[PDB]
């Protein structure tokens with residue numbers, strides 16, 4: 001619940017910005033959630049080269065429903081975790 | 084100030100930001116991020132910054148007054164956004 005705090009401190013504008021980013025990363029996604037596939041595309045689009053294992057790691061750190069995918073709520077937590 | 088946070092960054096993190104930097108200037112006139120490239124990157128990530136806001140973002144870290152972001156200033160931009 002340490003990160004749950006920082007997400008509640010985010011303004012509606014900040015959340016709307018992340019939603020716009022989230023919305024573009026899920027294009028193609030079957031269920032409308034970031035899967036390792038989508039995450040890998042965003043990262044590579046940003047010049048990174050992650051492995052399947054590293055991608056599953058990033059997702060697992062915020063996968064609170066155990067879906068193996070990131071939904072917008074878990075995504076806001078991913079951003080806040082950065083720092 | 085921020086120069087301290089940049090000195091803390093590992094060589095691996097800098098190389099990661101560098102890889103991002105290199106993709107953001109692909110086609111840059113002077114090999115640096117100008118408002119054109121900065122807006123391009125942000126639009127791609129679903130944002131819609133104004134010309135005035137893009138200039139502010141550059142200026143906040145433009146320590147040489149070129150109106151563009153070189154890699155050194157880019158690492159500040161990454162860090163400064165804390």
Ligand SMILES: CN1CCN(CCCN2c3ccccc3Sc3ccc(C(F)(F)F)cc32)CC1
Nearest residue numbers: 042043046048049050054078079082099100103
């Ligand atoms: C090998 N291993 C691969 C990944 N890197 C960290 C990448 C962090 N990251 C990042 C950093 C600099 C430039 C581009 C990117 S892409 C990216 C996208 C989302 C996230 C997100 F979701 F977290 F916010 C973090 C990152 C660490 C080492």
Ligand SMILES: CN1CCN(CCCN2c3ccccc3Sc3ccc(C(F)(F)F)cc32)CC1
Nearest residue numbers: 006021042046078079080081082083128164165
């Ligand atoms: C409090 N506030 C919380 C969020 N952080 C910014 C997180 C953004 N982010 C990130 C996080 C950790 C390490 C590297 C990166 S680069 C990066 C690249 C793309 C995205 C992408 F694609 F998602 F947009 C998000 C991020 C700033 C401070």
Ligand SMILES: CN1CCN(CCCN2c3ccccc3Sc3ccc(C(F)(F)F)cc32)CC1
Nearest residue numbers: 017018021124125128130131132136160161164
């Ligand atoms: C209207 N005005 C538009 C811009 N927003 C801030 C956007 C911050 N940002 C961001 C946040 C969520 C999703 C995508 C992006 S693109 C982006 C790229 C670089 C930076 C960087 F370099 F700064 F770290 C910050 C951002 C503030 C208000």
Ligand SMILES: CN1CCN(CCCN2c3ccccc3Sc3ccc(C(F)(F)F)cc32)CC1
Nearest residue numbers: 046082083088103124128160161162163164165
């Ligand atoms: C020390 N460490 C330095 C970097 N910051 C994270 C910067 C990530 N970032 C950012 C910063 C502020 C607000 C929003 C965002 S989203 C975002 C999108 C793209 C990039 C970009 F440019 F890479 F593509 C960088 C960022 C976390 C702490």
Ligand SMILES: [Ca+2]
Nearest residue numbers: 063065067069
């Ligand atoms: Ca999930």
Ligand SMILES: [Ca+2]
Nearest residue numbers: 145149151152
């Ligand atoms: Ca400059």
